[PDB]
């Protein structure tokens, strides 16, 4: 298992423009296009992202390319963030993957906001961090996914993803 396989499980793959859990226009493997309620604005962002006139539909290859870019950006975002970088550096490989996942989903800013949780992860207080992470809008809105991430931080293994 690895970060890519992990995110592919959590996000799925759709080749046509769709709305995510929050109602925002998305495509590919969880690639957010816009928060704007306009489909045309969405289509415009898509063309610009792909570099062609798309009609709202992309190929698998295109989806993978956006995915590759998005994961790299997630990582780079963590490392440039004063609050995130130190946590990530303190973590083992599996748990690092869990943090990237959260960043991919909610943005660096969002995650950087889990102050107390970040502190507990840094201190390696797994059970305490898990409880804390659960007290969040994130957990209440996407409980299954949140549960997977939480279990990953708690155990340091890929158990939550094995099977899927």
State the catalytic residues: 11, 20
Residue 90 marked in a binding site: no
Nearer to Cl ion, 15 or 90 (CB): 15
Q: By C-alpha distance, which of 80, 74, 81 is closest to 98?
A: 74
Helix (H) or strand (E) holding 13: none
Residue 44 marked in a binding site: no
144 binds Cl ion (CB under 5 A): yes
* Binding residue (CB under 5 A) for Cl ion from 7, 78, 99, 145: 145
Q: In whole angstroms, how large is the CA radius of gyration of the chain? A: 16
Nearer to Cl ion, 49 or 100 (CB): 49
148 binds Cl ion (CB under 5 A): no
- Residues facing 27 on adjacent strands: 31
Nearer to Cl ion, 87 or 130 (CB): 130
Residue 117 marked in a binding site: yes
Q: Look at the block and give the residue holding tokens 């992309």.
A: 58
Residues from 12 through 71 that contact Cl ion (CB under 5 A)? 49
Q: Give the Cβ contact number of residue 20 at 10 Å.
A: 16
Measured distance CA(153)–CA(147) in Å, rounded: 10
Applying CB under 5 A, the residues found at the interface with Cl ion are 49, 142, 144-145
């Amino acid at each position: 298992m690895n970060i890519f396989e992990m995110l592919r499980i959590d996000e799925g793959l759709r080749l046509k423009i769709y709305k995510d859990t929050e109602g925002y226009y998305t495509i590919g493997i969880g690639h957010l296009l816009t928060k704007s309620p306009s489909l045309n604005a969405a289509k415009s962002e898509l063309d610009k992202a792909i570099g062609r006139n798309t009609n709202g539909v992309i190929t698998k290859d295109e989806a993978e390319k956006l995915f590759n870019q998005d994961v790299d950006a997630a990582v780079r975002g963590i490392l440039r963030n004063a609050k995130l970088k130190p946590v990530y550096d303190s973590l083992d490989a599996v748990r690092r993957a869990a943090l990237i996942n959260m960043v991919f989903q909610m943005g660096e800013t969002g995650v950087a906001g889990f102050t107390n949780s970040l502190r507990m992860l840094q201190q390696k207080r797994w059970d305490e961090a898990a409880v804390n992470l659960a007290k969040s809008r994130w957990y209440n809105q996407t409980p299954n996914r949140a549960k997977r991430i939480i279990t990953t931080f708690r155990t340091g293994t890929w158990d939550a993803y094995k099977n899927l």
